[PDB]
């Protein structure tokens, strides 16, 4: 968990930038070299950066960021495996040519990741499109844990700037975060991924969203979107969490559809 800054190197380019920055470097290990995204910062801003760390430290799954470790420098410095395509908004922005089964793979990848995350008794709070990042086109990890708890033996919610377009009804009322909370704003994921990236409720206030939702109304179908991955967006919508699926029945509808959609290129 604590790490030798001199074997840390960082470059001069940044990756990303609140908090302050994310740059790139390399980790040296016990044999090989070890490339690196490290979150930087300029009381309490180092307190979020401890938390966050130590929920990821007990995080171990393939569609879920990994931690090397902390540093203590000029600045605090969260040092993670290196996701080298960055997030899954921006790379799908750039690249329209990605094929619906790819992006069924990838949504059905941050499903796993997220089932994981459920049996594990973990709140993500902040599951989004920019919060993916690719490893390869066909590899998504989950990330940003800063907004995350884990939740008490006894509490199956936590209890509270917001992402509110992420965020689920009960959320915004009554401040109580759940795994079928991130549910919710994992609809919200399938459908910036379907729509390549673009934000969703487009130029709509936070205030907007919430009266649009509580009418029964839900945002469209993108273009190109298989009906039956549509349906599991609305699905991951109900607006009563009771009602709502968790991420065992999401994850294994996304796993049988993607296997119907191998088995149709094959044919
Ligand atoms: C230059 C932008 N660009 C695309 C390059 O063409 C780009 C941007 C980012 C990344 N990669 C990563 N960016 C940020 C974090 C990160 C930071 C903080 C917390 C956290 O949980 C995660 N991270 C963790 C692992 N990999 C990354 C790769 C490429």
Aim: aromatic share 12%; with cysteine.
């Amino acid at each position: 968990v604590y790490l030798d800054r001199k074997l840390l190197t960082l470059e001069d380019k940044e990756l990303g930038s609140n908090f302050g920055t994310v740059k790139k470097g390399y980790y040296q290990m016990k044999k090989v070299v070890k490339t690196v995204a490290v979150k930087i910062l300029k009381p309490a801003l180092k307190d979020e950066l401890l938390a966050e760390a130590n929920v990821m430290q007990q995080l171990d799954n393939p569609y879920i960021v990994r931690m090397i470790g902390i540093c203590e420098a000029e600045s605090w410095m969260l040092v993670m495996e290196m996701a080298e395509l960055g997030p899954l908004n921006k790379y799908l922005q750039q690249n329209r040519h990605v094929k619906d089964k790819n992006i069924i793979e990838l949504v059905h990848q941050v499903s796993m990741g997220m089932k994981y995350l459920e049996e594990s008794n973990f709140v993500h709070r902040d599951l989004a499109a920019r919060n993916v990042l690719l490893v390869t086109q066909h590899y998504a990890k989950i990330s940003d844990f800063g907004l995350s708890k884990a939740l008490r033996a006894d509490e199956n919610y936590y209890k509270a700037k917001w992402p509110v377009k992420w965020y689920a009804p009960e959320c915004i009322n009554y401040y109580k975060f759940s795994s079928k909370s991130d549910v919710w704003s994992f609809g919200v994921l399938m459908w910036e991924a379907f729509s390549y990236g673009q934000k969703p409720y487009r130029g709509m206030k936070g205030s907007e969203v919430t009266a649009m939702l509580e009418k029964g109304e839900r945002m469209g179908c993108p273009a190109g979107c298989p009906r039956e991955m549509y349906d599991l967006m609305n699905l991951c919508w109900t607006y009563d969490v009771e009602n709502r699926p968790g991420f065992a029945a999401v994850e294994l509808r996304l796993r049988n559809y993607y296997y119907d959609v191998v088995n149709e290129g094959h044919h």
